[PDB]
Design a protein around this nucleic acid. Structure first.
Lengths: 162, 121, 49, 148, 127, 202
RNA sequence: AGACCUGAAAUCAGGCGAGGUUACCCGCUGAACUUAAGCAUAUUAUUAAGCGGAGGAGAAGAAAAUAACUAUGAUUCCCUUAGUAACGGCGAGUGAACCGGGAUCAGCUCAAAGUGGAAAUCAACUGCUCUGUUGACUUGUAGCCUCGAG
RNA sequence: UUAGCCGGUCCUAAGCGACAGCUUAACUGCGUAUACAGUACCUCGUUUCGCGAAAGGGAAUCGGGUUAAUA
């Protein structure tokens, strides 16, 4: 038979299951519990089509970008001011305070959860809108990292009604 | 009669043959010690066993010269040759690393140079 | 007797240190040596090895 | 008498005393071989001691003051190259203690010849002295040059 | 969602284990174009030190076809058989072996019925 | 900046947000072994401040030390000596448990060199620290100038000699002035006054 | 199916630790003989023995300092304060520090902000005399800043 | 002072060292806890390594001769 209920597991499997039990059982605080309240997968598909337009460049693209500037017009006027996603918490907290960020989009999963407890209030006090999205890994794919909090300070003209 | 400068001529085939030749003569001396002899014979053992030790030295000397010729100016040199010194001396950082400064402390060193000054009589 | 090879060699060595000193050694220059100091009789004084 | 402890362990004797004198004295000389032209220590200010029984006296201080160097117009940055102590803690509460040390600094910078780094002369960073160049004596020691 | 597992026990998975392959060689005997290879520690000569000659040993050589030698005490009974074959060019029936009080192996070596010992003892000069 | 917000709400320990979150963590730690590795910092706020830098060759271990005091180590509490010394139970030890933790992490990590430590939580029977370590053999630490000072041979086992932050507190170099006049070192100062100074002209 | 997160395995590739020495040095641990003409607090002693860790020196170190003056100005060491202030069955005994005069002199850098017109950073492996290919890294690496201001 | 057959060597007893960990500043003390066949494809899988008997367990040898001293 399948006895996959009754298996004496290793300690590491038993720990990463008894965490998920223990965080259901205990009374969670309202601030920590904020990230149980999340977008629908149809609501999240509406972001990931949008945010893929404003994708910051790969590290290999910096070479090819710079070969063009290495001077076809003249200095930094070889292009316009390039618009993209801003990322990494310690930039994006500054970018909320000085009041540039249009939307500020966040992971529920973030593992030391202290990192992101304060951010939903910051956004609400300044009147910046924010979301919560299922998966810090999904937000990582846009940025070209492994894994919290992404923001749009600036847009194109074409995509600004959306 | 062997001298070590003469063996630095001879080949890696030849050295082996000579080494073998001596060991025969060393063996046939041990037989004569056992059976019957005089002290005229038993001094010749001292010459030949120093002869053997020369031929091992010279062989091993050529073995290491070809290795050091080959691995010269290359990383991952074999452990057999690799500059002993002390344990503590081997550890540490290169003069370049100890010597090297930050971009900050470069600027404070550079812009305030060591001035030759004197006091008047 | 039923000894190990290690103990056989320790015994072995201390036979070979139990012989009179060579005659020619005293003859040589600047030597105060007279009869071996460490000689042992198998009854009188014992090894434990 | 305080000899109830095992005091024989910690008896310090002074048989080295002359050997210590002559070892200090060898490294003062071997310092001044390397310097030669350059004088040894560095210049220190005039300073009243603190509490009321040494209040009359004057002694040498640690180093000058960021206020005092601003009057003459050294940087606190550069002053250790010329051989002036900076002390960033010591204030000037009085006008009198200020104008003593400013006189002492200005008199020192009158003494100070400063060689070119080579080849060409270069103003500032007192000045570049040209190859006119009046004869400097060797290391004077700086305390003995400009005493209290 | 998960694999259907039958045993109640969790066992450790099997993984690839690479053999060593240590990049660059330790000692310089074993390299490409070394051409001075290592000379051997145990030759035929350092096994078989010397023959014995005594009243006890010479009695055997006549009658029982048997040569006595003093050999290195670390040596093996199969090495002595092959070292005696290399030196004197004679095939061995039966080696016996014995560590004297000294710390020296004495090897009694009976030769095969094909050969004779008094031919070989005169060739060496144990006579 | 985000690290300012982290230190400000880490100050509020008694709050329901942090007291929940610290009750869950202290559970996790007492399932795992006594000295074991974390793969990244629990408090990145706090470690950054103690000169942690997330590049290669920095690492970080947890450690757990039992709370409370130790008995004097005698058979059946039978002391032998003058009634002052008949004191088994209420002893204290000189050195804080933060420093003990740094010490435990000499044998387990002999090669690694300890930088600093910080509190990550506590329990009635345990008390948990994250100890910042370094590999001095690694070239990322060895090349760069700002933690090349740790690769010198003087900075071996500086946990054992009492030269961390927490080691330096129990020695009492953290105070200075008239209070600390007594203790270069407690022993070094003691040797200086005790010596009979016999100058050669008397 | 694919992104992470966590935990294992390997005689994987390349590294680092262990043990020894005792004069001096750093940290723990910790007595009694003895003195008090007894003795228990006290003393011997924050010593011996015990258990750790170093180096050519070690530790200490640029004030959360002394002071109450016309103020001084990292640390160490010497002389002096001083057998003083103070501790103590206020018994026996114990006992520093500041100022002063000397040796010697040397200052500094991280966290707390600000590349955000664009991780500028670091390691490993390979390639000519400083390119390429993987990884680390935005849960923060360079540059800037350290209160003497910035 | 000569061994396939005489013993050790191999097995486990009372017990004893270490693994996982657990204590303690360490020294020590405890220690059965654990993820430990049919290049490629399956299907099984509960015991952890070792030490500890020349009187316990255990593959196989007997006659006669021989040396100053071994069988």
């Amino acid at each position: 038979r399948d006895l996959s209920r009754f298996v004496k597991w290793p300690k590491y499997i038993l720990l990463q299951r008894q965490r998920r039990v223990l965080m259901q059982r205990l009374k969670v605080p309202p601030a920590i519990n904020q990230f149980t309240h999340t977008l629908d997968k149809n609501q999240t598909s509406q972001l990931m089509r949008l945010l893929a337009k404003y994708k910051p460049e790969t590290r290999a693209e910096k070479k090819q970008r710079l070969l063009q500037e290495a001077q076809s017009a003249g200095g930094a006027a070889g292009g316009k001011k390039p618009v993209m996603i801003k990322y990494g918490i310690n930039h994006v907290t500054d970018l909320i305070e000085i009041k540039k960020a249009k939307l500020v989009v966040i992971a529920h999963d973030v593992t030391p959860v202290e990192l992101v407890c304060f951010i939903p209030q910051l956004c609400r006090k300044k009147e910046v809108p924010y979301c919560i999205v299922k998966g810090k890994s999904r937000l990582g794919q846009l940025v070209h990292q492994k894994n919290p909090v992404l923001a749009i300070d600036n847009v194109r003209k074409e995509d600004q009604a959306e | 009669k062997i001298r070590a400068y003469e063996l630095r001529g001879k080949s890696q085939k030849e050295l082996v043959k000579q080494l073998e030749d001596l060991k025969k003569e060393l063996a046939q001396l041990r037989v004569a010690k056992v059976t019957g002899s005089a002290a005229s014979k038993l001094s010749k053992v001292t010459e030949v066993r120093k002869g053997i030790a020369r031929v091992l030295t010279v062989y091993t000397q050529k073995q290491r010269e070809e290795a050091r010729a080959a691995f010269k100016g290359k990383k991952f040199i074999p452990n057999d040759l690799r500059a002993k010194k002390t344990r503590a001396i081997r550890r540490r950082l290169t003069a370049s690393q100890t010597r090297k400064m930050t971009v900050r402390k470069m600027k404070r060193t550079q812009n305030v140079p060591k001035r030759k000054f004197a006091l008047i009589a | 007797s039923i000894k190990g090879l290690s103990l056989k060699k320790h015994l072995g060595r201390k036979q070979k240190q139990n012989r009179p000193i060579p005659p020619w050694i005293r003859m040589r220059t600047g030597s105060k040596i007279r009869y071996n100091a460490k000689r042992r009789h198998w009854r009188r004084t014992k090894l434990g090895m | 008498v305080h000899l109830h402890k095992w005091w024989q362990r910690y008896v310090k004797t002074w048989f080295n005393q002359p050997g210590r004198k002559q070892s200090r004295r060898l490294r003062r000389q071997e310092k001044a071989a390397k310097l030669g032209v350059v004088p040894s220590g560095l210049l220190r200010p005039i300073v009243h001691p603190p509490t009321q029984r040494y209040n009359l006296k004057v002694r040498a201080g640690r180093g000058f003051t960021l206020e005092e160097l601003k009057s003459v117009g050294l940087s606190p940055r550069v002053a250790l190259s010329i051989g002036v102590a900076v002390d960033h803690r010591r204030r000037n509460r009085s006008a009198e203690s200020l104008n003593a040390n400013v006189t002492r600094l200005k008199a020192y910078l009158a003494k100070l010849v400063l060689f070119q780094r080579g080849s060409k002369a270069k103003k500032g960073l007192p000045a570049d002295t040209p190859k006119s160049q009046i004869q400097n004596v060797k290391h004077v020691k700086i305390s003995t040059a400009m005493p209290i | 969602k998960a694999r259907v597992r039958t045993n109640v026990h969790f066992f450790r998975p099997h993984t690839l284990r690479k053999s060593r392959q240590p990049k660059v060689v330790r000692r310089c005997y074993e390299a490409a174009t070394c051409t001075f290879p290592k000379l051997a520690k145990t030759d035929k000569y350092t096994i078989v030190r010397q023959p014995l000659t005594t009243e006890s040993a010479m009695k055997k050589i006549e009658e029982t076809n048997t040569l006595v030698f003093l050999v290195d005490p670390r040596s093996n009974k199969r090495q002595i058989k092959q070292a005696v074959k290399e030196l004197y060019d004679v095939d061995t029936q039966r080696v016996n072996t014995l560590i004297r009080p000294d710390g020296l192996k004495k090897a009694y070596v009976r030769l095969t019925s094909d050969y004779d010992a008094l031919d070989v003892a005169n060739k060496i000069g144990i006579i | 900046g985000a690290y300012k917000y982290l230190e400000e709400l880490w100050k509020k320990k008694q709050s329901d947000v942090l007291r929940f979150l610290l009750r869950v963590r202290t559970w996790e730690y007492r399932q795992l072994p006594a000295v074991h590795r974390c793969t990244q910092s629990t408090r990145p706020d706090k470690a950054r401040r103690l000169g942690y830098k997330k590049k290669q060759g920095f690492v970080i271990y947890r450690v757990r030390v039992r709370r409370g005091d130790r008995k004097k180590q005698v058979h059946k509490g039978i002391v032998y000596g003058k009634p002052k010394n008949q004191g088994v139970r209420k002893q204290k030890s000189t050195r804080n448990l933060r420093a003990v933790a740094e010490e435990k992490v000499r044998k387990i990590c002999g090669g690694l060199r300890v930088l600093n430590s910080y509190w990550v939580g506590q329990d009635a029977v345990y008390k948990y620290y994250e100890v910042i370590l370094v590999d001095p053999a690694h070239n990322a630490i060895r090349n760069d100038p700002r933690i090349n000072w740790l690769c010198k041979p003087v900075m071996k086992h500086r946990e054992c000699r009492g030269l961390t932050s927490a080691g330096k507190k129990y020695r009492g170099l953290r105070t200075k002035g008239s209070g600390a006049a007594r203790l270069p070192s407690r022993r070094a100062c003691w040797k200086k006054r005790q010596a009979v100074r016999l100058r050669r002209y008397r």
